[PDB]
Amino acid sequence: KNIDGYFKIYSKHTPINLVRDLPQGFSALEPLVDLPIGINITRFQTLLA
């Protein structure tokens, strides 16, 4: 997300065992880094290997 140009990156990594769709369970994310870039982001794309 962004606040007045402050990009909030919240990262959480937990191991799971899943077939498809989504598992049912509670998760509380934690902040990772902060990038006060101050630019408008109208679009995004996911990079893959």
């Binding site: 007045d4 140009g5 101050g38 408008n40």
Partner: protein, 48 residues
């Protein structure tokens, strides 16, 4: 800065946006050079 920024009759290195289609939110930089259109007549990049 008058003893510095003032050169001859003017200094064009410092420019500004006089016209905008609306009020821009604070803490925003607008580099768009598009001609401001106050009417319904298309400007097509020239004054009129």
């Amino acid at each position: 800065s008058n003893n510095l920024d003032s050169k001859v009759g003017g200094n064009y290195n410092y420019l500004y946006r006089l016209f905008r289609k609306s009020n821009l939110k604070p803490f925003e930089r607008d580099i768009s050079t598009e001609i401001y259109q106050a009417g319904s007549t298309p400007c097509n990049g020239v004054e009129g």
